[PDB]
């Protein structure tokens, strides 16, 4: 199916720019930036939309695919093909960054693929909640942040309201992902996307970071998987209730 | 009225991206930035305009609503419905950030919701003028800065002059709010919006910051409420006098 | 003449965002930035073009007015009316920033309007070349940098080549002024505009900074006045020779 | 041939904004930035596309010219004329920055044009791989990074898929070069362009930096020349296989 390779290609490109920006922020502090993370993932989404926006819609996100189907906009038969396409692309993008930044991660870490400590590198690929946070509040943040993403996504592409001019939606959508990081990313790393979080964390477990990538943060791994699903659905519902009312 | 929920939805979204960016700048200095505050509020306005620009005009600002009515552009009957819509949305967005950043504010402040000191957090939600400033100069800044906002807003949307191409005004308007922060925000925190300032400060008084959120800065709270009203009106007048002359 | 007030209004707005960004960089280092200076002047130009692009062309720059007339594009009779319009607007924008940042400049400087020392403030309004530079190389930089501005301006607005889509030229032009600062501003402060430099420096001499604002840097003041005139003309010539060849 | 001067003019402009941004990052740390390097080269590409996008396509890059010809999109006879046009423009842009930043480089370096040490300046013009890297991994990075550039370039300009709206492709293309730096530039300096790397390094050898500009990094100079050629070709192939499948 053409929507499989479209979701694969757009998610791969998006995650390369994304996870590469995060690797920059962690590895070097003269070449890395939290703002660069916001820009790398944001405008990384802009490139993916140019890749697959006209073929599959360029979801690059299992939450917005789940929310579109659960809202009667995409047939339920296309949910597995969309999810596996972005899961495979995100997995391969994690392997891409790991190999491109290999000696950079090695020299920085001295050869220790660590998840805790002042030299940890697991946070490049997946999300790990800071020490000041609780798992329930991380669920609340991921749900609310994905809700903001879905509500704002509908408004940018709503041809019956006030959408971005066609041919520029790629810009406005990337800017939304930029400011979601700038304004809401410190508390959880704004995963807002199961395809962005679980495939790279699965890669880190196989790569050699071990099993603590899953158990860190009171078994944190499942929250970026199900919390955005509830968030994206809730966000889309509130817009559709806001629209026509 | 549809313009009530439109102003509510756009102001809520705008203030979430706004107050979240400010929380970042205060809480963490590796994930926060004054430029991020400029971007979070700026492109936060961009998302609100996509939400309500075609339904209500996406004022998200009692000064531009007051200036539009006082300039004979919006009927005076729509002033209370617009103001309460953005006041309620801004109030709820302040409660949204407080709950999402709850333990972040607690761990940073040790459990003390303070307004002064090296660990104060009241400045996340509302404006507090720096020690080098006077209340009269804060009135002058808020009036002049809102005047710049209203004059520039008219120019960006003036279909009879040189406006932004339709479908891209959301971008240009956000950029205006970005540079108002970059170029003019240090002296007062560029409130430029009664709906942005008073509802979150009222929330901080109820949340537990106490009554000093109102008395700080020689009873500073009323200036972001009335000074932008005079500024936006003056700014719009000078453009309309500049136009057709 | 309508082009007088258009050049006045657009230059005033541009210089408020410009000189305010520079004041930020000098006064506070948590709220100020060299990148913010690049953004404040860059997208400040974007707002001016929306003000006067359709009425006068939004020159906001005596070099591009001189280059347009000397290239047979604007009648020579409109050179004095354009220059005095932007000179008056830039002068009043310098007075605007000085009054808005008054106590900020006073508290930072302790009450001393100084041009040298670790607490100087004259550099907010006009340009002063660093100690590592020579006056001849400052002439070379201002000429080459204005040449880049004029050549790139023609390309962005050349309806017979590859211009920015109408209604978005304000964006692309501001971005050009951003990167001229980012890439070429350290050596001279990229004045690239007599209207940007001389009127604010004249204001600083009257405001109380004294006469060293003119004599600093081996009588530096005249270079941002005549060097951009030669630069803009040369830059425009090379494009017009490049076009149709 | 008009495509010669078009490639010359666009590459010259692009490299002036590019190499000037890098000079900023190296020479001063209050006026320079790695993000500024990303912006200077990124939106420098935006200006070049406005110069030559409609005349020659604004390649400004021997890898994308090689990839276009090897993919049957540009006649093979136009490969030498395109390459020498951008090589000459990039060479002259390197001489432009060296003369504009002359005393800045001299005062910073005390008069020593050095390639190693805490005061080296050769990295302004060409790429030098960090100490934590291997030459083979630098080949892998330059190939993969140019592949990302070519794949994303096709998607932005594919009139049969989801391209940027005509008249705005200059913006989206520059943004792509920005995030390639933000997300992937630390490991190699993302040369992604033989015309960007070899001509300035040849200039540094003649300027007086000596022969170590070529021998540094296990004879690093040839990798930015041939690795992007393989990368751009591979990236374009994968898109064209992705398209229509």
């Amino acid at each position: 199916v053409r929507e499989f390779l479209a979701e694969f290609m757009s998610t791969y490109v998006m995650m390369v720019f994304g996870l590469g920006s995060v690797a920059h922020m962690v590895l070097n502090k003269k070449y890395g930036s939290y703002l660069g993370v916001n820009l790398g993932f944001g405008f990384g989404v802009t490139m993916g939309v140019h890749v697959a926006g006209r073929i599959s819609g360029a979801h690059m996100n299992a939450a917005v695919t789940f929310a579109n189907c659960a809202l009667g906009r995409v047939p339920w038969r296309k949910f597995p093909v969309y999810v596996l396409g972005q899961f495979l692309g995100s997995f391969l993008a994690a392997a891409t960054i790991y190999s491109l930044f290999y000696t950079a991660i090695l020299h920085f870490s001295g050869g220790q693929l660590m998840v805790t400590g002042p030299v940890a590198t697991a946070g490049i690929f997946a999300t790990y909640l800071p020490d000041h946070m609780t798992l329930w509040r991380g669920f609340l943040n991921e749900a609310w942040l994905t809700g903001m993403l879905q509500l704002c996504l509908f408004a940018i592409t709503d041809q019956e309201n006030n959408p971005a001019l066609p041919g520029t939606e790629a810009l406005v959508i990337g800017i939304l992902v930029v400011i979601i990081g700038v304004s809401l990313g410190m508390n959880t790393g704004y995963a807002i996307n199961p395809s962005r979080d679980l495939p790279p964390r699965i890669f880190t477990f196989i790569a050699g970071w071990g099993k603590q990538v899953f158990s860190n943060g009171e078994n944190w791994w499942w929250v970026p998987v199900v919390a955005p699903l509830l968030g994206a659905y809730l966000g889309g519902i509130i817009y559709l209730v806001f629209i026509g009312s």
Side-chain angles (χ1 to χ4, degrees), chain A residues 1-53 55-245:
Chain A
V1 191
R2 49 205 293 275
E3 286 135 320
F4 169 77
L5 319 163
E7 283 299 311
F8 160 82
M9 196 61 60
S10 58
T11 307
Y12 176 79
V13 171
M14 179 268 291
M15 293 292 295
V16 165
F17 289 117
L19 297 187
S21 70
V22 184
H24 271 76
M25 179 190 60
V26 172
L27 278 45
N28 192 329
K29 303 72 172 54
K30 273 314 118 164
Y31 300 150
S33 199
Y34 181 63
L35 187 62
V37 170
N38 311 145
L39 295 166
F41 262 111
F43 292 117
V45 167
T46 292
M47 301 306 147
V49 176
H50 281 297
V51 162
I55 305 172
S56 66
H59 290 185
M60 310 170 296
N61 190 325
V64 312
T65 305
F66 171 87
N68 275 280
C69 303
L71 277 161
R73 306 167 45 82
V74 177
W76 270 113
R77 57 178 217 265
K78 300 199 190 219
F79 183 73
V81 57
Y82 272 52
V83 160
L84 182 102
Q86 50 212 26
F87 261 52
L88 205 143
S90 175
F91 188 85
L92 264 49
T96 297
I97 300 297
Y98 173 71
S99 152
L100 289 177
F101 286 77
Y102 184 55
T103 72
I105 296 174
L106 284 201
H107 155 268
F108 167 80
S109 92
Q112 272 55 60
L113 305 181
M114 298 224 56
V115 185
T116 324
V119 80
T121 55
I124 295 169
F125 303 88
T127 53
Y128 300 89
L129 63 154
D131 309 296
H132 67 77
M133 281 285 297
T134 78
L135 180 122
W136 173 85
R137 285 215 129 76
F139 188 95
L140 178 68
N141 267 257
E142 281 294 326
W144 217 273
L145 269 42
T146 319
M148 298 283 306
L149 176 78
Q150 190 65 70
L151 184 127
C152 282
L153 255 172
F154 275 177
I156 295 168
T157 59
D158 195 343
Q159 297 308 308
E160 308 191 293
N161 191 10
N162 190 40
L165 185 70
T168 80
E169 313 112 316
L171 220 73
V172 188
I173 289 174
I175 294 184
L176 164 66
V177 177
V178 172
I179 54 181
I180 284 187
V182 168
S183 296
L184 300 163
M186 65 155 51
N187 297 309
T188 302
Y190 66 118
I192 69 170
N193 182 355
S195 305
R196 168 264 181 286
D197 195 80
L198 185 57
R201 187 190 313 278
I202 290 181
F203 170 81
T204 56
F205 168 60
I206 301 181
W209 273 269
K211 214 258 166 175
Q212 52 283 66
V213 304
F214 288 102
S215 71
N216 198 317
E218 287 107 301
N219 286 339
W220 166 247
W221 68 273
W222 62 266
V223 176
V225 162
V226 59
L229 301 179
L230 178 124
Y233 180 76
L234 260 299
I237 293 263
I238 296 145
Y239 181 85
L240 285 178
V241 167
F242 151 77
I243 220 74
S245 199

